[PDB]
From Swiss-Prot, chain E:
PANTHER family: NUCLEAR INHIBITOR OF PROTEIN PHOSPHATASE-1. Pfam families: FHA. This is Pre-mRNA leakage protein 1. Coiled coil: none annotated.
């Protein structure tokens, strides 16, 4: 369904490109709005910021697969490159639906220590992330543990 | 942005708000020669659970008023009948611990009718709540005026907000929407009905905005409430301190 | 001359500001601060900063004894707005608070309870730069909270600052320690909460922090305790500080 | 990986022959896309398709 | 009543905007090339042929007092898409035109030889730039500011009458 | 003198309307961008197989909101999507601010996404 | 009547539609091969995931449960999500009719949930309702997909 | 050029909104001042450069009452006031015929001695 | 390409800190780095040794080669340069994957 | 007579290049999602009092 | 409505639908009733990307005979009583019927049913003009050849 | 020529336009490393008025496969005068293209049979100036103190003929400008008898 869809979307790009080179219009943004997240690679990679250096990147497929032999830890996405392809999946609706299947946010938070904090609501809850200051106390004065 | 007073509305035991401004209602008319005429139109008792958003709209037909006088204190004795008839029909898992009345005048007639239920507390608000402006909601106004019988209607005033906000947050959105329909009804309705592509679902009371479209509109209702305080009292907002500004926005 | 385009170029900015402090000797402080209340709450950041410079230099000349109760109310409210909107590490808003609060000292007393709860709120915020300014404003206000005799308010701030000594961000952590130094050198050491024999052992591993703002603030607070309350730590604990 | 594909080019030419590898690659001025022939007579010319 | 206002705006282009847009030292040059302008060598590479099957183009200068001594100069016409024909006396001038003629009756900017790509087909044209003394193709006067299609062997003169023509310009196509 | 104040107050009110823009006196600028959504309905117009037969080219001049002549060819871009008038050369004159403006706008929108998507627990 | 091959981890079986006795409708995991000059569907391609790459996925789950950092509960969950996403977004349709891989996916999601339960020293199911594992990380959960 | 310096500092602060800009003060003003012009450029020549950023509805070149030659500055009004922000911060410091022009926002005051000049201007721009 | 290995890593040994310092030097003075690459492609014919380690995959083990960091900058340039030129000049035909 | 500025073969709307196209490609390796769950994370200010516009509307 | 929230069609909703119809004849009836609700009421609501998923959903169930060809009886091609969004539904439903069946098999089934609103052979020559013009725009002129005879006789 | 299947991606000729557009936009658009290469110089900060410093008067096709040549002498001969050549490739933090012109005795290769002592002295001066300008801190610090002592025995003519022209090139960096202004100031203090043509050049 991706491949049938990108057959359609790239042929629709090619006609609107000819309609606008013919008539000296500019393409309005709404002509390519519905197809922005379709395609293989993606419509949206036509307009990314570093597209002019990425035209010089050649043989990027075989480069990514030969990192087995030179890197000890590699990503499991050896087969796609989102600079050249765009991101080829979207999972935000899983996150909404798994909340709904657990019973809602009120049912989830009755399990927790939310009420002992004293906060009134939970839409602005933020967990501390990794900052780069965890081992910013020592330099080499650091044991094996 | 939020009042520090009403955090105890949202504990786990059931509460219920009761408001009675719209019970006995009158439109001015003129006689066909020309005069002042006072006809009674239909009225409603407003009853809200602030946790769940359940709205028990008790419609009051004009047929009850046609045979009496001194109606302005007969009205409050009818409200205490219907609220107490409402409490008895609920099973005791669902009966409220508290009824909160928006007016001081309702404490004595409700405590007369609630003698059968001694554990239930009846107490007034230190808040001032704009529940009288709920007749400016279109779906609610149509049902009261199409009514030919005394009848109860359940509504859901929170639509579907509860999926993604807490009831603390929905009660704050509600009483800002109801406060701005009270201060200036017609310009408040322009803000809600500005975009035609944003539609109200048939079983919903409000247009289905996105979560960023609600943040924009909530900022516009606060600017309506302040801009009309400045017209009414001839004050610039620059002369007001920040603590006075949140006092105006929250009543 | 008090427009957004004047505030954007620095050489016109410093000339319009000097003319305002020159003219305010004739015009008075009450006439001048009333004119600066609108640039102190403007949406543009560097126009808001230009007003904080003019406010600090006017109050340092003339005092605040001219101001009535309503301008003191409006002035303090505007400074709080310009503190709440700050997004860069410019220091004049703290020089501005210190100048106004030293001027009107005991008249500052009804304003102390809302500013402290604002400081306590910002210490819960997720941006580190917001947490850091909150503990900078705490350290500025400490001698005015003492002068208004509010010793229950100083011990509330000191127990809450003590609970934040586990902070990972060094620029926030250093200004927490500075404010605990400022409270401690004001207070009576027996009345202090938490007691010094709890505070000093918590400071001793923080001496191994490698960042300079944590270090120079912690040596001062260890050295203040070694002057004022040395018998509250055992001798083998003072030698671990020497090493 | 550059060496590896040029080294594997040799084995393709030993498996196909000069004649059939020219059919699949197209003329050098106007080459074929992947699995594209100039005609069907060229396609059916050889049992390797 | 004699004049409304003595001041009276112009609403007419002075030279400076067209001078800065269309570049040459000092004097603004007319003839912006149209969008289908191509050099012959860029037309041969797009069709991809070796030089034995490429078509060349050249403008050989034959003197009118004698064609017998041979070429005056030989100008190869493949490297560019347009060539300005103009006045290069050689005795102090400033260089304007690519193809310079030592003719006093010719302007600095007299005519251009313009290559175009009309539906995949290269076609050499020529335009009179509304010069002082006019231009004649095949000893026929030409109307100004339209591209007249050239063919092989044709002769360009830089003056309207046969009195002032001292050189010839032969367009040769293989 | 109350006569004289009104004659001056009209003079302030006359110079106020004379210095004020014609788009701004008439109507809000939100609507013409919303009229671009009315053409977004006309993307459904091209899909319809019946529209093939009604469609003919009846070429309309691009025209300002007050109704004034505009430029013909495709123009360089600005932050407000204002279109050039018919007296323009076609020569692009700039100190290059508008390109430098669009670069910060892209940069802000990019940086909002990466602040979430580069986080690690 | 079958032409079988295996490429890039996919097992492909091709039936022409003229050779099958009864043409029946299929789920996802079977392709419709279309004849280009007519646009008609003339063959069917059936898809599975190769046995060699079923074992590669199981060895990936064994590697996750042995790495440094696999005692930290959200780190283990995050590695479960990267390898599960990288499996499902690569094969997508071939997973459907590949039954030994579904059995291995059940065992792995149990083993990673057992790493959390054993790191808290208890296996009672009343202490670990599914909200502890499947609530998103922005609400304080593990966020296992 | 001081205007081009304050736009760089505004852009680095990430302001980018017109209502938070220093341009916001002049939201009622549709006229612009154009200065440091070359002496040969004329009214129809000014409408050509400045039409890139919108539609100019009035123009006034100021030129002496005796000799009738250009003082070196002009005024121009746009149909849309946002074209004023465009011209001010995008055409400022642009070298046109040797000299770099200066553009600023302005309040224009028309005079009596240039009255019939204003219709000799208006009949050109009423055509379009 | 060489930099993206370090996008994740928290604790680096001395060889990884030495590796990032050379890349940051190549950003800061790109013309002197580019002349170092040409000097090596013309003259350098003896090289430092390569370390090998094995990866655990439970069904097989697989070797990983770690090349010297200063030599990797030249090899990474030459990798990008050779695939860019083969693609322009159409060395590899359409069937090669 | 003015030599026009050279324009590309296809002109585009401005919004193609200010949108931040393919910006989610610069992620952490273990990021599942593209945006935050709540809008309250991504916004800085819920509401800011603009004394300029509110005073214009009153007066 | 769950299926139109996807970006593309999928075999999941079509395979699930067929299992319900071949279970019991009341599920057969709910699918015949829903096809008329989608065409007569709900057509105005749907965007063009949602009409690709609908016409391929219904054209897949029509071509494997879980719906009769006589469910297309409700469709009438008319200048006045054909929605622009309704005509987009027929194009997407018939492109799916051509791909599955093939064009020669599709002419067998359109002959076997008696659906007049698609192929009018009885009169009203402006409607016979509309239908031939409809189907050649879709890519189906071979279907039109019976109606092409009736028009040249009348003119 | 028939496709044998369909198109599912960007078509073939349409990718090549997009690769040709980046070729055309490549000279106009500034690269990130091209950005750093300019920013190192003092000239990048300057106004046009400030850049007036440098104005100041200081006084037939044949096609077919052929293999590349067996010894690519040409290729080595072209790049051996840009990289290797002859210099101290261990004490300098960098060597620039403009450094080829000014110093140029160190870059040259005439090892013996120089021109009687005095030009042995002329090379050591350009050795001192290269180590001051480009050298690391140990090399700079000694040759700075050596040049201060050897200045009185060198001619003032010899130093300012070589030192002053470096201060006029457009490639110069901020620390490189400072160190040569510093060398002038240490040289001027000792000699004290300065002629009228050299006062003008300073």
């Amino acid at each position: 369904n991706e491949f049938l869809d990108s057959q359609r979307v790239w042929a629709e790009y090619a006609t609107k490109r000819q309609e606008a080179i013919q008539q000296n219009r500019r393409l309005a943004f709404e002509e390519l709005e519905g197809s922005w997240d379709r395609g293989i690679p993606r419509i949206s990679t036509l307009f990314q910021r570093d597209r002019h250096t990425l035209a010089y990147d050649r043989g990027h497929r075989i480069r990514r697969e030969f990192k087995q032999y030179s890197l000890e830890r590699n990503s499991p996405f050896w087969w796609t490159n989102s600079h050249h392809d765009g991101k080829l999946w979207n999972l935000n609706a899983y996150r909404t639906d798994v909340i709904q299947a657990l019973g809602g946010i009120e049912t989830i938070l009755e399990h927790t220590l939310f009420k002992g904090t004293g906060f009134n609501s939970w839409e602005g809850l933020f967990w501390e992330k990794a900052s780069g200051f965890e081992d910013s106390m020592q330099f080499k004065k650091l044991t094996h543990a | 942005l939020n009042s520090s007073n009403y955090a105890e509305l949202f504990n786990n035991d059931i509460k219920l708000f009761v408001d009675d401004t719209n019970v006995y209602r009158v439109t001015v008319h003129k006689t066909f020669e020309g005069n002042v005429a006072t006809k009674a139109i239909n009225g409603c008792i407003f009853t809200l659970n602030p946790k769940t958003g359940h709205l028990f709209l008790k419609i009051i037909h004009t047929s009850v008023w046609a045979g009496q006088k001194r109606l302005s204190q007969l009205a409050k004795w009818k409200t205490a009948e219907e609220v107490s008839a409402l409490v008895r029909s609920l099973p005791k898992e669902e009966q409220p611990k508290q009824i909160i009345v928006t007016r001081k005048a309702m404490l004595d007639p409700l405590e007369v009718h609630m003698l059968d239920f001694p554990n239930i507390a009846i107490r007034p608000t230190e808040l001032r709540l704009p529940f009288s402006a709920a007749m400016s909601i279109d779906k609610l106004s149509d049902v009261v005026m199409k009514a030919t019988e005394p009848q109860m209607v359940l509504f859901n005033i929170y639509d579907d907000w509860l999926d993604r906000i807490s009831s603390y947050t929905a009660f704050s959105r509600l009483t800002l929407l109801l406060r701005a329909l009270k201060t200036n009804e017609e310009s408040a309705k322009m803000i809600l009905l500005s975009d035609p592509t944003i539609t109200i679902k048939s079983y919903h009371l409000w247009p289905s905005f996105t979560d960023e479209q609600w943040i924009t509109i909530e900022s516009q209702m606060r600017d309506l409430i302040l801009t009309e305080y400045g017209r009414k009292y001839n004050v610039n907002i620059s002369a007001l301190t920040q603590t006075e500004i949140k006092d105006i926005i929250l009543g | 001359f008090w427009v957004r385009r004047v505030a954007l170029d620095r050489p016109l900015n410093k000339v319009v500001t000097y003319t305002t402090v020159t003219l305010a000797k004739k015009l008075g402080c009450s006439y001048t601060i009333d004119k600066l209340l609108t640039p102190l709450r403007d949406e543009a950041e560097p126009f808001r900063t230009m007003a904080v410079h003019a406010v600090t230099r006017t109050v340092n000349l003339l005092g605040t004894a001219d101001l009535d109760e309503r301008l003191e109310t409006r002035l303090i409210d505007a400074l709080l707005i310009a503190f709440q909107e700050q997004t860069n590490s410019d220091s004049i808003i703290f020089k501005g608070f210190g100048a106004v609060t030293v001027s009107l000292d005991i008249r500052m007393k009804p304003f102390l309870a809302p500013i402290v709860s604002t400081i306590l709120n910002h210490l819960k915020h997720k941006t580190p730069l917001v947490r850091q300014h909150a503990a900078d404003l705490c350290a500025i206000l400490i001698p005015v909270i003492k002068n208004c005799h509010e010793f229950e308010m100083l011990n509330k701030l000191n127990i809450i600052l003590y609970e934040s000594l586990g902070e990972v961000y060094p620029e926030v952590l250093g200004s927490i320690i500075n404010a605990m130094y400022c409270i401690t050198s004001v207070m009576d050491l027996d009345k202090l909460q938490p007691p010094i024999n709890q505070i000093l052992p918590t400071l001793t591993p923080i001496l191994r922090n490698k960042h300079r703002k944590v270090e120079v603030n912690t040596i001062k607070f260890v050295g203040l305790i070694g002057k004022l309350a040395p018998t509250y730590a055992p001798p083998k604990e003072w030698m671990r500080i020497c090493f | 990986s550059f060496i590896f594909q040029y080294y594997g080019l040799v084995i393709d030419l030993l498996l196909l022959g000069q004649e059939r590898a020219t059919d699949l690659a197209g003329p050098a001025n106007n080459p074929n896309e992947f699995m594209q022939f100039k005609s069907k007579e060229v396609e059916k010319a050889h049992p390797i398709r | 009543k004699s004049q409304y206002i003595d001041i009276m705006p112009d609403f007419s282009p002075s030279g400076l905007l067209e001078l800065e847009s269309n570049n040459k030292e000092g004097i603004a040059l007319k003839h912006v090339e149209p969008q289908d302008a191509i050099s012959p060598d860029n037309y041969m590479d797009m069709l991809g042929l070796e030089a034995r099957d490429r078509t060349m183009y050249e403008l050989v200068i034959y003197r009118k007092n004698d064609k017998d001594k041979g070429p005056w100069k030989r100008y190869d016409l493949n490297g560019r898409s347009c060539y300005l024909v103009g006045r290069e006396l050689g005795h102090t001038e400033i260089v304007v035109a690519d193809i310079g003629i030592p003719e006093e009756t010719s302007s600095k900017q007299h005519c251009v030889i313009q290559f175009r790509n009309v539906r995949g087909i290269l076609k050499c044209y020529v335009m009179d730039l509304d010069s002082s003394n006019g231009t004649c193709l095949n000893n026929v006067v030409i109307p100004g500011a339209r591209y007249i299609e050239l063919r092989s062997g044709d002769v360009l003169t830089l003056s309207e009458f046969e009195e002032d023509n001292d050189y010839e310009l032969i367009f040769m196509n293989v | 003198s109350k006569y004289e104040d009104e004659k001056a107050a009209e003079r302030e009110q006359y110079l106020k309307n004379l210095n004020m823009g014609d788009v701004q006196k008439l109507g809000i600028n939100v609507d013409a961008h919303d009229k671009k959504k009315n053409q977004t309905a006309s993307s459904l117009t091209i899909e319809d197989p019946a529209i093939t037969f009604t469609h003919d080219k009846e070429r309309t001049v691009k025209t300002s909101l007050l109704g004034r002549k505009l430029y013909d060819k495709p123009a360089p871009e600005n932050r407000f999507a204002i279109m050039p008038g018919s007296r323009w050369d076609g020569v692009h004159r700039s100190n290059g601010f508008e390109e430098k403006w669009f670069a910060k706008q892209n940069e802000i929108n990019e940086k909002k996404v990466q602040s979430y998507t580069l986080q690690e627990d | 009547p079958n032409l079988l091959f295996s490429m890039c981890g996919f097992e492909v079986r091709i039936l022409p539609r003229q050779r099958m006795e009864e043409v029946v409708s299929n789920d996802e995991g079977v392709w419709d091969l279309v004849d280009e000059r007519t646009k008609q569907r003339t063959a069917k391609a059936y898809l599975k995931v190769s046995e060699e790459e079923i074992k590669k996925f199981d060895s990936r789950i064994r590697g996750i449960l042995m790495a440094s950092g696999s005692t930290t509960f959200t780190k283990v969950a995050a590695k479960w999500n990267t390898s599960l996403i990288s499996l499902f977004t690569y094969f997508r349709e071939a997973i459907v009719a590949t039954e030994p891989l579904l059995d291995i996916l059940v065992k792995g999601e149990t083993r990673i949930q057992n790493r959390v339960k054993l790191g808290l020293n208890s296996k009672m199911p009343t202490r670990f309702p599914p909200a502890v594992f499947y609530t998103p990380k922005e609400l304080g959960g593990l966020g296992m997909i | 050029n001081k205007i081009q310096q304050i736009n760089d500092k505004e852009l680095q602060s990430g302001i980018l909104s017109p209502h938070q800009s220093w341009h916001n003060e002049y939201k009622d003003n549709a006229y612009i001042y154009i200065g440091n012009l070359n002496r040969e450029l004329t009214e129809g020549d000014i409408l050509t450069v400045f039409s890139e950023y919108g539609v100019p509805v009035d123009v006034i070149l100021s030129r002496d009452e005796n000799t009738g030659e250009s003082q070196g500055f002009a005024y121009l009004k746009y149909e849309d006031q946002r074209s004023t922000i465009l011209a001010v911060d995008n055409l400022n410091g642009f070298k046109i015929g040797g000299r770099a022009l200066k553009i600023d926002h302005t309040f224009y005051r028309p005079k009596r001695s240039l009255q019939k000049y204003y219709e000799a201007v208006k009949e050109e721009l009423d055509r379009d | 390409d060489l930099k993206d290995v370090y996008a994740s890593k928290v604790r680096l040994n001395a060889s990884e800190r030495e590796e990032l310092a050379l890349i940051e030097e190549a950003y800061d003075n790109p013309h002197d780095t580019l002349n170092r690459i040409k000097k090596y492609l013309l003259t350098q014919r003896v090289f430092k040794p390569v370390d090998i380690t094995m990866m655990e995959n439970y069904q097989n083990i697989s070797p990983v080669y770690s090349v010297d960091p200063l030599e990797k900058i030249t090899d990474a340039y030459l990798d990008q340069y050779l695939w860019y030129e083969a693609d322009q000049r159409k060395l590899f035909p359409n069937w090669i994957k | 007579a003015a030599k026009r500025s050279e324009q590309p073969d296809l002109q585009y709307d401005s919004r193609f290049f200010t949108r931040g196209a393919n910006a989610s490609a610069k992620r952490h390796e273990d990021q599942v999602y593209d945006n935050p769950l709540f809008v309250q994370q991504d916004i800085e200010s819920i509401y800011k009092t603009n004394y300029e516009k509110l005073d214009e509307a009153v007066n | 409505k769950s299926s139109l929230q996807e970006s593309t069609f999928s075999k999941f909703y079509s395979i699930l639908s067929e299992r319900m119809i071949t279970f019991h004849r009341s599920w057969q009836t709910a699918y015949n009733e829903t096809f008329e609700q989608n065409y007569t009421q709900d057509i105005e609501d749907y965007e063009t990307d949602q009409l690709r998923i609908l016409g391929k959903f219904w054209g897949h169930l029509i071509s494997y005979e879980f719906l009769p060809m006589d469910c297309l009886k409700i469709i009438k091609l008319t200048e006045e009583e054909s929605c622009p969004q309704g005509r987009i539904f027929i194009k997407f439903l018939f492109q799916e019927l051509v791909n599955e069946l093939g064009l020669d098999e599709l002419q067998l089934r359109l002959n076997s049913s008696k659906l007049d609103g698609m192929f009018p052979l009885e009169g009203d020559a402006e409607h016979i003009r509309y239908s031939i013009n409809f189907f050649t725009a879709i890519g189906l002129g071979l279907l039109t050849e019976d109606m092409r005879s009736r028009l040249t006789i009348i003119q | 020529s028939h496709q044998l299947g369909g198109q599912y991606s960007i078509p073939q000729d349409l990718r090549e336009n997009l690769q040709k557009e980046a070729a055309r936009i490549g000279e106009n658009e500034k690269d990130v490393l091209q950005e750093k290469m300019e920013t190192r110089t003092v000239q990048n900060r300057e106004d046009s008025y400030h850049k007036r410093r440098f104005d100041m008067k200081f006084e037939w096709d044949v096609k077919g496969y052929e293999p590349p040549d067996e010894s690519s002498t040409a290729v080595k001969e072209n790049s051996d005068s840009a990289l290797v050549n002859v210099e101290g490739i261990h004490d300098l933090m960098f060597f620039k293209p403009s450094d080829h012109k000014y110093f140029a005795d160190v870059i040259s290769k005439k090892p013996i049979d120089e021109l009687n002592k005095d030009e042995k002295k002329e090379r050591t001066l350009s050795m001192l100036l290269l180590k001051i300008k480009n050298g690391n801190t140990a090399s700079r610090r000694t040759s700075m103190r050596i040049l201060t002592d050897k200045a009185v025995t060198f001619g003032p003519e010899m130093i300012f003929n070589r030192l002053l022209p470096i201060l006029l090139d457009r490639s110069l960096e901020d620390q490189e400008r400072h160190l040569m202004i510093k060398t002038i100031d240490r040289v001027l203090y000792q000699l004290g008898d300065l002629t009228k043509p050299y006062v003008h050049k300073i």
